[model samples]
Target: GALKKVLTIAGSDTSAGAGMQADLKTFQELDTYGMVALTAIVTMDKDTWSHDVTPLPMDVFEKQLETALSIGPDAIKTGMLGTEEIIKRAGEVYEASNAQYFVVDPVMLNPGNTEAMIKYLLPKATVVTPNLFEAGQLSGLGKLNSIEDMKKAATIIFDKGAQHVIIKGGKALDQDKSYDLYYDGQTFYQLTTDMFQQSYNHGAGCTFAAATTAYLANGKSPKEAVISAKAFVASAIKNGWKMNDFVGPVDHGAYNRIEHIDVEVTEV
Candidate 1:
């Protein structure tokens, strides 16, 4: 197949809701070959909702990255990079690849390491998608209580070197509707969707970034990619399902699916 190859460097969620699990599914569904550099293994207790994460050995992680880079992905996205060293090394690999697209989903952090991510990772990111909480952390701006606050945070992050910043204002925003702000230094766009009254969006952020990578690999501009990715994630969330008592997972295949004619199928 001549499909574009997109890579994800992130953790592995045992529940298959987030991390590389969700990313791979998203890339494939959106017509890109998916590759991964596994960074950690994460387990969540159903009742307690506590996370137990185990980082992979650096040597093993490095080997996986080496293999993935050798294939030369067309685009790449990062999520839940477990440690400071891993984040630094991942950024190095991404810079060396010089892929046309780079999306960063800032996950798993301490205050000092968060700064390390902004300094080391965000600088190389083509696009950075951060939820409200993560945006607040990345911006070092206490808490984002309104859309204006989100805008300020996006500017702070964009100044940190990310070419574009998308602040995901899901249900956390102080509104009946979900709002997301996109900034590319010169302009800002607000993307909104009807807020779903459910909690089945465990992997929404990773899925959104992965979808954007796939679309970008397929030749869409960054703005178009982000818009389409937002819709894709929204459809997935609207059709999400409860995987267990602890959480639910978004459906990667929830987007528009057209019936193929017999000739169309035969052509493939």
Candidate 2:
């Protein structure tokens, strides 16, 4: 067969720092072909680091989705969708897709959008990647400070229908080391790695989730994909460089190009 193909349904970050830009980068870096269904455009203020979002029309998104699924993809992932309406449409479209995997990068949003995801998106997800804060939000656990705290939350989200859940324990856990929890309904895997202190992780979350999608396209299991993605994101963040005085982003090329870069992730 040809190279495995994956698609990202996400907003555009003109900075090429995060959002779909990062997702496509990760897909390509992982040796999988990538495509996009652009849902919105996000611009960031360099000075204040504030964000401005402009959602494309619902019809525009649907047409892109049409192209995204035109030839069929091995896997699909959703990032920062801009509106409740678009999220609903995406939920329906993704469910109807025969793609091998559907990864949900749960971006915290307005109450309406949040409810719409729970109602329409969660059930269709193969795996849902949420950061500690977002996991807490989804699990109604408020805050997750330990691996056990994350497990309970992961279980709650698993009960919602995602075949697997990866909860990234970043700074929100107040830990020196980064801890990510992966639950596949039956077994729980703890993916632990060093915290790249003061590193530019602006694109880390999207990159991590996108990497998972690509690996799934590459025929990895849920456990294998989550572990490999943890290593990939760690490598990217470790080699990150400053983009400007305000914010920087993870380097997607690092994992593929840097020879001495080690995965260094311990899965237990």
Candidate 3:
């Protein structure tokens, strides 16, 4: 099959809701081949579901990444890149690959690794999707409390060199609606959807980024990809189910595989 290829250099979530697992799931549903270069494996404590990440050995990590990059993916996205070394190396991978779209999801990284991400990954990112906190981190603006704050932060991220910056104002703006702001270094677009207040949205962020990657792989522009991805995520969240008390994940197949079912009843 000549399906567009998408690669994820992210941790593996044992829950299978976030991380490379969700990215792979999103790629398949959006008509693409999914590839993974695992940076770490995440394990959750049985009692409280507290998460812990176990990093992959550098040699192993390099081998996996080399294989994934050999094909030159159409789009690449990174989430939870473990260490400063790996983050920097992942940026180098983008430079070496022929991939057209590079989406950087600056996941949980401390100050040291954060600097690595900004210094290395920021400039090369074709599209960097950050939440309010992430926007704050990238922009070095502490905290974002409103759309005005978000705009300020988005502007700073754009200045830092991301080709397109999408600041997810998810629940940080209005409680009634989920608003996300997009900055293409010129115009600002607000993406809005009715808020679904639930604990059943564990992997929404990862899914959104992956959806954007798939759409981009299929030739959608940055703006178009974000719009469609937002709608796709909303529908997934709208149809989300609770797996446990701690968290749940959106059904990636909601919009594509299971949008409508025609089942005939048979009573014998």
Candidate 4:
């Protein structure tokens, strides 16, 4: 047994601020070997990328999946699949390969970009992680304006086939402290942390999902993986440096300096 290997199946963000870029960064920062299966290539500017067009062809996406699985990954994570067609292909491919410990971060948009995620990826996920808005859209729950709605939406999505649902409660609260609710088909696990209180909140989702795969590849339970991921995202959020004058992502980069942390932030 050597370094645990994990594959990130996602789209490319040329900004290197989120999506596959952020996922790979998390794997490396957390000391796990990383692989990638690129579903689509995105051309991004400093603040955003345009999604006015379609994603890559289905055949190309399938080939990337084949290439990634040929190496036999310890874990597989899905993120920001550009279209529903690609998402469908990924679900089929993942089931065929029987990839272990699946983690899904439903990335539909980039930095306020309007491109929606493909619908085919939702029901096939083992553990689907969605932010407050994304979860609401998937569950058909409009405007998840409160924590109560967040919990309800998690159960609704769990019924859709995700074995474990991590409803990223980042926006459920009107305050700076946010929570993530996990529904593992049988029970709910609540994870609370500060929301970094910054305008630059990019890559937070990618970091959360990637950290889950990194820990689970090391043999952490689904529960343990989520807990540790929450912690890592919190740390990344607190110490996250500004990406630009506009948008900022989590500081998964190890070269970034961090100050003393306040561990007293309680979880609800």
Candidate of highest lDDT:
3
Between the candidate structures 1 and 2, which one is better when assessed by TM-score? 2
Local accuracy of candidate 3 as per-residue lDDT tens digits, 1-268: 4899899999999999889998999998898999999989999988899988798899999998888888888788999987889989988988898898999998863588778888999999988989888888889998899877888988888898899988888766688878888888878877887787566888889999999999999999998888888887877777788878887888888878556322111111
- TM-score per prediction, in order, is 0.92, 0.94, 0.94, 0.85
lDDT of each: 0.84, 0.84, 0.85, 0.73
Model 4, residue 74: displacement in angstroms? 1.7
lDDT of 1 by residue, 1-268 (tens): 5999999999899989888999999998988999999988998776797989998899999899889989998888999887788889878888889588889998753677798798898999889999999999999897898878988999899999999998888878744666788888888788877676467888888899999899989999888888889888888887888877778988878886532111000000
Query: For model 4, what is the C-alpha lDDT against the true structure?
Result: 0.73
**What stretches of model 3 exceed 4 Å from their correct place?**
258-268
**Candidate 2 residue-wise lDDT, 176-237, digit = tens:** 77778899888887777777855577888999999999988999988889888888888888
Report the lDDT of model 4 for residue 153. Answer: 90
What is the alpha-carbon lDDT of model 3 when measured against the actual structure?
0.85
What lDDT score is found at residue 48 in candidate 4? Answer: 56
The clash number for model 3 is: 0
Model 2: runs farther than 4 Å from truth? 259-268
TM-score, predicted candidate 2 vs. hidden true structure: 0.94
Model 3 residue 144 distance off true place after TM-score fit, in angstroms: 0.3
lDDT of 4 by residue, 120-194 (tens): 555666688888888887787877877678778988888777778888776555566767787787777677765
